Amino acid sequence: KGEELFTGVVPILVELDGDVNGHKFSVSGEGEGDATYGKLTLKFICTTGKLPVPWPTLVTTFVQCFARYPDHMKQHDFFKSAMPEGYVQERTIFFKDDGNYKTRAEVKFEGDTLVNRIELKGIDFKEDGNILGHKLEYNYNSHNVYIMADKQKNGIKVNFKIRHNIEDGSVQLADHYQQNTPIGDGPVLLPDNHYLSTQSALSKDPNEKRDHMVLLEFVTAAGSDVHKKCPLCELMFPPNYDQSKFEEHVESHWKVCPMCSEQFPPDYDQQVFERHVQTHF
Amino acid sequence: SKGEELFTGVVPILVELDGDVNGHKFSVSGEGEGDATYGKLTLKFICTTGKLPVPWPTLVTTFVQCFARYPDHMKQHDFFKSAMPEGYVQERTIFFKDDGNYKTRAEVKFEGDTLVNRIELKGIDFKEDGNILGHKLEYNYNSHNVYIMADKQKNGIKVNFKIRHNIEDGSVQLADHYQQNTPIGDGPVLLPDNHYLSTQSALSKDPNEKRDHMVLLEFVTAAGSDVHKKCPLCELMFPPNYDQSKFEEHVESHWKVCPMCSEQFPPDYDQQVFERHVQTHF
Ligand SMILES: [Zn+2]
Ligand SMILES: [Zn+2]
Ligand SMILES: [Zn+2]
Ligand SMILES: [Zn+2]
């Protein structure tokens, strides 16, 4: 059915189970999404007491299938083309000078409803760092989500850097390493490299006493022809510069196998990467 | 309180702007609605005179902070609403770093049931292939904290913040905002303690609209403390539980302040002219 599911308002459900440095918690979310606009509305409750991490840290984690792809780009919309069987979205999120989240989500239809079921593990976080110290402002900014085909899987590798504003006016960065791969064995769109321009606003229902977040998200697809910047680092490329070498550069941030050049999140814990390299010898 | 009673539900909004930036004349009209109970604000703009000569994001701040959600424990600090329905004059100078500036004069006030922001805007000293006239801003917006101060000399507020406009080459164009609001009517108004408005915005598009336009969504809510706070307009830091009057003093120092009556002027204000204001006291 694919893009035909997304012509109107789709109801959304979200469930997450999380363990960050041993603090276990669960969140439930409900709302709806309108890919015609790229518009997405979602309210979250913490179902297990008071949330141990700040809500903004979870925003990316809580459905890029609701992006508006312009007509001239329908052919690059992986997200929607894997539906309704859906996809696995995995991420590692490196909070600079602090811990990281590792997430595994399945996003897919369950009847008429679009569901994001997530499990999330955080480790190595500082106790009075920006995350566990609750030092993030309750807000969000624009970002450009760079998207690449992983032809040799049958999905996408995705990269971007979130800017979380800190109550002392500094910024906490969070590098996102993301892969999406289809759940069904139907065929899917393998896109050319492009971006999703995302914008967000977090607010609060004033008649809600529980600890919650209301997230509004506006996502729409694109992708420039003079100066181009790297998604992860701030490296700036001169005007009109071999786009395959830009790509090469981005890949280089991933941990790369010297044999088959498969990419992995650049974790401190090499254990999983080390298992892969032994597959060749 | 009195004027905050108008803002208890959904209020319709109208916006008109006339602009001259480096001689390029243009007009914009806007319409939408605002819900202060949520701090929610929705607005669609058209350019009524042909091509918009500056990028839409540059105009966002310019295009109704009376729709902010003030928490119950802060109703007493809501100037915006307390001046309504006669409303207020909002004036701003906006300095685009290494580029020109906007100077704006708006009246925001009720006209019947409808809340209206009528604006006159003048821009000058802009570079021809700078980020503004070169159309190099990305179509998006970020969070900002709008710091608010009383000015009893004028019976209103002085307001400051620094907008971050993302540039298509991944750099950022900063824009420093110097703002004053003064009441239009004779009635008394709330003179607030220093606080700030946490604003967040998203620009999108109506896909059924063929004309060049902007849809603006804005979420504003009031706050402001224990920890380190950076000045609204520079990277200088203030330590925990700092003397809040000296913070104010510091902020004022980014403006031109008359040492007699303490009337405040934006920092580009001509020295010669500032010197004749001071002679006004002798
Ligand atoms: Zn890079
Ligand atoms: Zn390998
Ligand atoms: Zn300062
Ligand atoms: Zn004076």
Q: Which residues of chain B neighbour A197 with C-beta distances below 8 Å?
A: 138-140
Q: Identify whether the C-beta of residue B109 lies closer than 8 Å to the C-beta of residue B87.
A: yes
Name the method of structure determination: X-ray
d(CA A238, ligand 1 centre) in Å:
14
- Count how many pairs of residues, chain A against chain B, have C-beta atoms within 8 Å: 94
Cα distance between residue A39 and residue A9, in whole Å: 9
Q: What single-letter amino acid sits at A11?
A: P
Ion ligand 4 — residues with CB under 5 Å?
Answer: B 258, 260-261, 263
> How far away is chain A from the Cα of B215, in angstroms, using its nearest Cα?
11
DSSP H or E stretch at residue B69: none
Check whether the bond before A52 is cis (ω within 30° of 0): no
In a domain, A166, yes or no: yes
Count, residues in chain B? 282
CB-side exposure of A43: number of CA atoms within 13 Å? 9
SS3 of A53-118: CCHHHHCCCCCHHHCECCHHHHHHCHHHHCCCCCEEEEEEEEECCCCEEEEEEEEEEECCEEEEEE
In a domain, B55, yes or no: yes
Interface residues of A toward B, Cβ cutoff 8 Å, are: 36-39, 68, 135, 137-142, 144, 163, 165, 167-170, 197, 199-206, 216, 218, 220, 224, 226-229, 234, 236
C-alpha separations of A169 from A66, A136, B162, B231, B254 in Å: 32, 10, 12, 8, 18
Structure tokens at A135: 């030092």
Rg of the Cα atoms in chain B: 19
Domain of A60, CATH number, reads: 2.40.155.10
A201: nearest CA in chain B? B200
Q: Which residues contact B34 (CB under 8 A, 6 or more apart)?
A: B10, B11, B13, B40, B41, B42, B64, B67, B115
B281 known member of a binding site? yes
In a domain, A262, yes or no: no
Cα distance between residue B182 and residue B156, in whole Å: 5
B66 known member of a binding site? no
> How far away is chain B from the Cα of A224, in angstroms, using its nearest Cα?
8
Structure tokens at B125: 């000293």
Cα distance between residue A103 and residue A90, in whole Å: 5
Structure tokens at B74: 């802060």
C-alpha separations of A195 from A141, A221, A223, A224, B123 in Å: 16, 6, 5, 10, 33
B222 strand-pairing partners = B197
Q: Identify whether the C-beta of residue A231 lies closer than 8 Å to the C-beta of residue A159.
A: yes
d(CA B251, ligand 3 centre) in Å:
6
> How far away is chain B from the Cα of A243, in angstroms, using its nearest Cα?
15
Q: Identify whether the C-beta of residue B232 lies closer than 8 Å to the C-beta of residue B248.
A: no
Structural domain including A178 reads: 1-223
Closest among B215, B221, B205, B174 to B67, alpha carbons compared: B221
Q: Which residues of chain A neighbour B168 with C-beta distances below 8 Å?
A: 224, 226-227
Long-range contacts of A259-264 (CB under 8 A, 24+ apart): A260/A152, A262/A152, A263/A150, A263/A157
Closest among A58, A13, A79, A30 to A219, alpha carbons compared: A79
* DSSP string across A22-65: TEEEEEEEEEEEETTTTEEEEEEEETTSS-SS-GGGGTTT--GG
Q: Which residues contact A6 (CB under 8 A, 6 or more apart)?
A: A35, A36, A65, A66, A80, A83
Q: Identify whether the C-beta of residue B6 lies closer than 8 Å to the C-beta of residue B185.
A: no
- Number of domains, chain A: 1
In a domain, A105, yes or no: yes
Instruction: Please answer yes or no on whether B168 and A142 come within 8 Å at the CB atom.
Output: no
Q: Which of B200, B225, B231, B247 to mutate to test the interface with A (most CBs of A within 10 A)?
A: B200
Instruction: Please answer yes or no on whether A169 and B237 come within 8 Å at the CB atom.
Output: yes
d(CA A33, ligand 2 centre) in Å:
38
In a domain, B249, yes or no: no
d(CA A147, ligand 2 centre) in Å:
22
Cα distance between residue A143 and residue A220, in whole Å: 11
Q: Where are the alpha helices (DSSP H) in chain B?
A: 79-82, 244-252, 271-279
Residue A280, SS3?
A: coil
d(CA B247, ligand 4 centre) in Å:
22
Cα distance between residue B97 and residue B67, in whole Å: 29
Interface residues of B toward A, Cβ cutoff 8 Å, are: 37-40, 69, 138-143, 145, 164, 166, 168-170, 198, 200-207, 217, 219, 221, 227-230, 235, 237
B90 strand-pairing partners = B106, B181
> How far away is chain B from the Cα of A248, in angstroms, using its nearest Cα?
19
Q: Identify whether the C-beta of residue B41 lies closer than 8 Å to the C-beta of residue B124.
A: no
